[PDB]
Design a binder for this molecule. Structure first.
Ligand code: CLA
Ligand code: CLA
Ligand code: CLA
Ligand code: CLA
Ligand code: CLA
Ligand SMILES: CCCCCC(=O)OC\C(C=C=C1C(C)(C)C[C@H](OC(C)=O)C[C@@]1(C)O)=C/C=C/C(C)=C/C=C/C=C(C)/C=C/C=C(\C)C(=O)C[C@@]12O[C@]1(C)C[C@@H](O)CC2(C)C
Ligand code: A1ECV
Ligand SMILES: CC(=O)O[C@H]1CC(C)(C)C(=C=C/C(C)=C/C=C/C(C)=C/C=C/C=C(C)/C=C/C=C(\C)C(=O)C[C@@]23O[C@]2(C)C[C@@H](O)CC3(C)C)[C@](C)(O)C1
Ligand SMILES: CC(=O)O[C@H]1CC(C)(C)C(=C=C/C(C)=C/C=C/C(C)=C/C=C/C=C(C)/C=C/C=C(\C)C(=O)C[C@@]23O[C@]2(C)C[C@@H](O)CC3(C)C)[C@](C)(O)C1
Ligand code: KC2
Ligand code: KC2
Lengths: 225, 228, 236
């Protein structure tokens, strides 16, 4: 992608461009992944701030105790919702995300799918398909998938695919601006805060507080921030 | 061949500075031992100093922050937060002795001609590569994994990549020597390094005496502790 | 060997031969390299079998299940459920009088001695697992000796594995290796949950405390020599 918008061009003040091809592929992969994660996080934050608490948490859904999903949802914004879940829940969610990331980085599965060098190198952003042959052979047939589980993208031309990829890159850049702006607006800051937007965590980057084994860290008070 | 290699390595280390030898130690026969052995000794000692300084800088950060292993071991005697000069002040005396002994064992293995000639190498003064460590393959009882590459993920490296790695190692070693003695100098005299003023507390004991302020004599070994 | 590459691929086609330590090159016994891979394979298979046995034993001993037999020795002794009344399945081993643990350990030792014997292994047709041969193979208790006839052999006592498909036997060996690794993880998770309460996401508040050592077979009640002198200092 040379330039989606002709009026901008190649805005590379840091000089990271014109580098090794593996470095450029890793940079493009990081940009696409950060944009997709930011868009998903912004959508989830908007849904949580509006209030979409599910009718769930029955039959021992908290580890013999039964704490309602609305009780976890009655803490404020998404930042307070990420600090009210139990340690096993956050740990298993992070484990599922890590399993998906490791399956995406898998060069054996990518080469079976007909791709290029892994760690999201050639054709970055391509999630490997968890189906068919030589993958997930031990039960777990995976009737769904990651990309297009319902097959809405069954047929698409290469030019249409490239245009959709460029649109996804532009929307990912806009979402990387927007989700960070929303988190900053939660933490005071930004421009036109408004909209209540509750309170904010210590930094949002604390991850899993109130855990056991390595969570005895009173260091989240300072370090400027 | 000796000074020419020395010029080439100095040029690769820094194209601007190049060969900088104001003292001319690369012309002094250190033991009446020609030129090749003298530059081999000098390069080996520079590389060893740089590696030890890089490890010491990382360890100084780890001890100054407070990064203990866990239980039972020598970390249990060290108080929780004493700054890095004082963590080699509270470990037991035999722990210091055995640490220095294991370092000497590693140096002796790195110098023993049986280990060097096992994997086809000679002494750095006698014509070997300076800073090289022979793997383990002479030590009577077998050793599980080597010291340079423990998991052997660097076996596919090109010779050009290895040369650039050596140049980066030497530059990082020099800069880490400078940083580590910035720390040690600020721990002794105030106002030497202006950036580190007020971060590192002052220390009274001697840094160049290993067993000065020697640690206690405690037995941390349980189960069958016949050495009470 | 280098055949263990293909065996690791057959165990899991995604992750092949996985050895960061490169322990197949480690010649720990200073024999041939073939002997080293043979020892490692036999150790893995034996560890796995012991782990599945211990896992099922832990599961069926952790919830109020005990045999209605006696284990008394004559008008007095354990009622065979007083060991169940000692706590979870780690105080139960430390409550089996004195001679019970001795006879169990000696039975396992004689079984391993029968495993290792080249005259017994060679009479079945195989060899020792490092001197070629097949790893994990238990020789017949009938053909090798034992002058009084015994009813069954250890492997397949009732005979419900005879004339099986050889590829089915290879698939069973691979499944044995995989389930052995999984069972080792399970049984060490349980043993960690005995002593350490804060470990693992699951299993919270479901495991007995067992203020003792899991790795100490003989307990403080044994009247063997030393033992009490050997238990005069605990650890972590
Ligand atoms: C772990 C949670 C998770 C994650 C990370 C994703 C991730 C994604 N889903 Mg998805 N999805 C999920 C659960 C999840 N889904 C569940 C539980 C359902 C059932 C309601 C769906 C139903 C679903 C549909 C119907 C579609 C996606 C699509 C997508 C992609 C945009 C993206 C890769 C879209 C996609 O891949 O199309 C391009 C799409 O059309 N998802
Ligand atoms: C799903 C895998 C998993 C996860 C997330 C953890 C997570 C943790 N373990 Mg753990 N552990 C596991 C499997 C796991 N364990 C298994 C299989 C074993 C048995 C070998 C152990 C044995 C174990 C011990 C012995 C200890 C932990 C400890 C810890 C904590 C640091 C942390 C909560 C430590 C802890 O919190 O103790 C207080 C600790 O000392 N673990
Ligand atoms: C003990 C550590 C040590 C050792 C053995 C070497 C060894 C070497 N260096 Mg070297 N170097 C070091 C640390 C060291 N360096 C540090 C910390 C820096 C960064 C400042 C450099 C920067 C450097 C450059 C830029 C170059 C070398 C080069 C060389 C090689 C030839 C020069 C020579 O004869 O030695 C160097 C001289 C000595 C080691 C003198 C010994 C120290 C004296 C006796 C004590 C002085 C103490 C005193 C307080 C210092 C005051 C500092 C200040 C007031 C001036 C030789 C292999 C040349 C090269 O690249 O060849 C490959 C070269 O061009 N060095
Ligand atoms: C017993 C352990 C031991 C041994 C045998 C060696 C051996 C060696 N080291 Mg070495 N080293 C060690 C530990 C050891 N190291 C430790 C723990 C460190 C810190 C991490 C280093 C850091 C180090 C560096 C940085 C360098 C070496 C180098 C060397 C080599 C040459 C040293 C030399 O000629 O100096 C000989 C030194 C002495 C004879 C002095 C020894 C100290 C004496 C015994 C102290 C006693 C004095 C005291 C007053 C007595 C008290 C009692 C009295 C009152 C009666 C040699 C292979 C050099 C090298 O390889 O360059 C090519 C080099 O540059 N070493
Ligand atoms: C002690 C039991 C044991 C033994 C003897 C073996 C033996 C073997 N394994 Mg193996 N394995 C084990 C347990 C064991 N495994 C477990 C529990 C798992 C699941 C996590 C696996 C998963 C596994 C895979 C995926 C593969 C092997 C392979 C192999 C073979 C060659 C590699 C090798 O030598 O590694 C031997 C490793 C050890 C002996 C472990 C060392 C134990 C140390 C000394 C103790 C402390 C370390 C610590 C507990 C381990 C790290 C914890 C980790 C969870 C973070 C060899 C036959 C390869 C193969 O199939 O080739 C035939 C292969 O690709 N293993
Ligand atoms: C039972 C088997 C295990 C026993 C272990 C043991 O007994 O103790 C173990 C123990 C404590 C303990 C115990 C427990 C384990 C906690 C529990 C037990 O509890 C019981 C049973 O009761 C016993 C107990 C209390 O002891 C602590 C161990 C500590 C350890 C092992 C500390 C290493 C420092 C390395 C340093 C400082 C590096 C220096 C730096 C070095 C070496 C170099 O720079 C080398 C190098 O420069 C050279 C020379 C040349 C260069 O070219 C290359 C480089 C640059 C590389
Ligand atoms: C494959 C099936 C499966 C099993 C067998 C388990 C194990 C397990 C048990 C036994 C409980 C209940 C224990 C109890 O209450 O007794 C439990 C729970 C949670 N889990 Mg894990 N888990 C995920 C993370 C998560 C969260 C948020 C919670 C809970 O809130 C709840 C919980 O523990 O509450 C404190 C995700 C999301 C990415 C997915 C998934 O399918 O997405 C792809 C799964 C799937 C599985 N989980 N998980
Ligand atoms: C007065 C003033 O204001 O100035 C201040 C400035 C400043 C900066 C604040 C100060 C300071 C402190 C300083 C200068 C600190 C310097 C510290 C330094 C320079 C520390 C090196 C570590 C190197 C390591 C650990 C090597 C790892 C090596 C590794 C991991 C490997 O070998 C692996 C690998 O290599 C292979 C084998 C081959 C390749 O595949 C590459 C890789 C990596 C995979 C001072 C003192 O206060 C002074
Ligand atoms: C058709 C045919 O060939 O006939 C026969 C012939 C043949 C060959 C003789 C057969 C046989 C013999 C037998 C009887 C074989 C039996 C094998 C047996 C008994 C196998 C047990 C495994 C136990 C496991 C894996 C436990 C895992 C344990 C796990 C995974 C855990 O606990 C995980 C977990 O703890 C963690 C790690 C952390 C926690 O936070 C979470 C939890 C708690 C979940 C067969 C197979 O019957 C078939
Ligand atoms: C704690 C100690 C320590 C530190 C902090 C450290 C730092 C770095 C850095 C980062 C600054 C780089 C980039 C780097 C790279 C290389 N190291 Mg070092 N290294 C340390 C230890 C050793 C030992 C023991 C050996 C060794 C070697 C090599 C070779 C191989 C060259 C070749 O085979 O040509 C390369 C490329 C081996 C060698 O032979 O050096 C002559 C060898 O024996 N290194 N090393
Ligand atoms: C209590 C301990 C124990 C457990 C828990 C256990 C579990 C499983 C599982 C389930 C995960 C499977 C799938 C499985 C499969 C096979 N086992 Mg087990 N097995 C145990 C003990 C033994 C012994 C003692 C022997 C043995 C063998 C085989 C053979 C091959 C037979 C043949 O090819 O001759 C196959 C296919 C024999 C052998 O290894 O022969 C090379 C042999 O001697 N097994 N085994």
């Amino acid at each position: 992608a040379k330039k989606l918008n002709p009026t901008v061009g190649l805005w590379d003040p840091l000089g990271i461009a014109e580098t090794s091809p593996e470095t450029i592929g890793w940079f493009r992969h990081a940009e696409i992944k950060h944009g997709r994660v930011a868009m998903a996080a912004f959508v989830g934050y908007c849904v949580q701030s509006n209030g979409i608490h599910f009718p769930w948490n029955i039959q021992g859904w908290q580890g013999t105790p039964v704490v309602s999903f609305a009780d976890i949802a009655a803490a404020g914004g998404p930042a307070d919702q990420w600090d009210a879940l139990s340690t096993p829940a956050k740990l298993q969610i992070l484990g599922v995300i890590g399993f998906l990331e490791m399956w995406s980085e898998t060069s054996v599965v990518l080469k079976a799918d007909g791709q290029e060098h892994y760690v999201r190198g050639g054709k970055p952003g391509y999630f490997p398909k968890l189906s068919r042959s030589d993958e997930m052979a031990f039960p777990h047939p995976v009737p769904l998938n990651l990309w297009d589980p319902f097959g809405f993208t069954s047929k698409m031309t290469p030019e249409r695919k490239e245009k959709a990829l460029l649109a996804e890159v532009n929307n990912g850049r806009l979402a990387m601006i927007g989700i960070f702006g929303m988190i900053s607006a939660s933490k005071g800051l930004q421009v036109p805060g408004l909209d209540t937007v509750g309170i904010k965590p210590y930094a949002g980057e604390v991850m899993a507080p109130f855990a056991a084994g390595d969570a005895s860290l009173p260091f989240v008070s300072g370090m400027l921030e | 061949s000796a000074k020419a290699d020395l010029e080439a390595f100095a040029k690769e280390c820094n194209p601007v500075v190049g060969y900088w030898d104001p003292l001319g130690l690369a012309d002094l026969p250190l033991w009446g031992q020609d030129q090749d052995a003298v530059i081999g000794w000098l390069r080996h000692s520079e590389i060893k100093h740089g590696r030890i300084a890089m490890a010491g800088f990382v360890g100084y950060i780890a001890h100054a922050n407070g990064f203990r292993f866990g239980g039972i071991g020598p970390q249990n005697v060290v108080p929780e937060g004493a700054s890095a000069p004082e963590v080699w002040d509270s470990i037991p005396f035999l722990a210091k002795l055995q640490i220095i002994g294991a370092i000497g064992v590693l140096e002796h293995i790195s110098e023993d001609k049986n280990f060097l000639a096992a994997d086809g190498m000679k002494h750095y003064m006698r014509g070997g590569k300076p800073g090289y460590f022979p793997t383990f393959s002479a030590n009577v009882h077998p050793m599980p994994l080597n010291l340079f590459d423990p998991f052997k993920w660097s076996k596919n490296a090109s010779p050009e990549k290895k040369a650039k790695g050596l140049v980066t190692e030497t530059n990082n070693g020099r800069l880490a020597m400078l940083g580590l003695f910035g720390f040690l100098s600020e721990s002794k005299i105030p106002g030497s390094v202006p950036a580190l003023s007020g971060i590192i507390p002052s220390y009274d004991g001697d840094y160049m005496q290993p067993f000065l302020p020697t640690g206690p004599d405690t037995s941390l070994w349980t189960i069958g502790n016949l050495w009470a | 060997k280098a055949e263990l590459e293909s065996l690791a691929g057959k165990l899991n086609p995604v992750i092949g031969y996985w050895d960061p330590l490169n322990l197949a090159d480690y010649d720990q016994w200073s024999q041939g390299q073939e002997a080293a891979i043979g020892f490692l394979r036999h150790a893995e298979i034996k560890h796995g079998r012991v782990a599945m046995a211990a896992f099922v034993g832990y599961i069926v001993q952790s919830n109020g299940i005990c045999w209605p037999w006696a284990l008394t020795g004559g008008p007095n002794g354990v009622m065979h459920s007083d060991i169940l009344a000692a706590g979870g399945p780690a105080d139960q081993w430390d409550a089996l009088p004195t001679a019970s643990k001795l006879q169990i350990l000696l039975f396992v030792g004689g079984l391993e001695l029968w495993s290792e014997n080249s005259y017994v292994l060679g009479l079945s047709g195989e060899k020792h697992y490092m001197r070629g041969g097949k790893p994990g193979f238990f020789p017949s208790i009938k053909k090798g000796g034992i002058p009084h006839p015994v009813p069954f052999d250890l492997f397949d006592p009732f005979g419900l594995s005879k004339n099986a498909s050889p590829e089915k036997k290879a698939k069973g060996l691979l499944a044995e290796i995989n389930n052995g690794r999984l069972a080792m993880l399970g049984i060490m998770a349980f043993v960690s949950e005995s002593k350490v309460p804060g470990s693992v996401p699951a299993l919270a508040g479901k495991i007995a405390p067992y203020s003792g050592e899991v790795m100490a077979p003989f307990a403080a009640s044994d009247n063997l020599p030393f033992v009490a002198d050997m238990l005069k200092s605990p650890l972590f």
